[PDB]
């Protein structure tokens with residue numbers, strides 16, 4: 001597990017896939033923008049993510065990839081994760097406050113991780 | 121357009137989303153692993169991508185995010201793209217050869233770009 005937390009601190013772009021009625025949608029954030037709480041909750045600051053919110057309002061299911069070449073994984077150098085969870089947009093509580101330093105943030109995207117597999 | 125080509129040369133992880141019958145799927149590669157040909161074709165070396173190929177055999181539609189903080193975009197520092205295209209697995213031709221230096225590559229994933237929007 002300690003691999004995952006070292007990845008959060010490093011440089012890297014996160015990818016977030018949602019399910020629409022017109023196919024998947026795909027958006028980004030930075031590894032270091034993420035905030036982890038208890039209950040397997042990863043919190044994302046929301047500036048835009050309008051299409052994403054539309055998709056999530058209808059289908060909680062989300063996928064996320066993140067990693068870093070600086071954190072050593074399965075076959076030595078580098079590591080990547082594929083995370084499956086359920087998503088929710090929150091405007092209040094501990095989850096919104098975790099990302100509150102991002103003054104531009106209109107909401108928090110809260111991903112509750114159901115599984116994480118190392119892909120690298 | 122010259123922004124896109126500068127992004128390919130830089131450090132960065134690409135995200136590729138496909139449509140399954142069980143929801144979206146999401147896989148990675150590196151910006152510098154990509155190969156661009158004419159006909160709006162971006163070529164990806166395939167080592168694994170078994171679930172991805174299953175999804176693509178059924179639904180050509182694909183989304184891709186890639187970028188770099190080192191290439192200056194819309195609001196100054198950084199740039200990201202969201203690419204929509206159609207995918208195909210090729211085992212021969214110019215498209216496979218473009219990625220042939222990757223000896224581990226069993227195939228080429230060929231993305232024909234229908235649209236690219238700057239997201240950063």
Ligand SMILES: Cc1cc2nc3c(=O)[nH]c(=O)nc-3n(C[C@H](O)[C@H](O)[C@H](O)COP(=O)(O)O)c2cc1C
Pocket residue numbers: 013025026027028029030033045046047048049050051052053187199200201239240
């Ligand atoms: C590297 C990168 C990081 C980004 N970080 C965020 C972010 O932290 N929060 C956010 O709302 N959008 C971020 N964006 C923009 C989103 O990917 C997305 O385009 C925008 O939020 C609109 O979302 P939507 O397409 O679901 O409407 C980032 C884009 C890039 C390329």
Ligand SMILES: Cc1cc2nc3c(=O)[nH]c(=O)nc-3n(C[C@H](O)[C@H](O)[C@H](O)COP(=O)(O)O)c2cc1C
Pocket residue numbers: 067079080081119120133145146147148149150153165166167168169170171172173
């Ligand atoms: C940073 C990173 C780069 C990767 N590059 C490739 C790649 O270039 N080609 C490839 O087949 N898989 C690559 N992978 C692994 C794929 O994301 C994926 O897990 C694997 O190919 C299996 O595909 P599938 O889940 O569709 O079966 C990479 C993973 C990471 C984290």
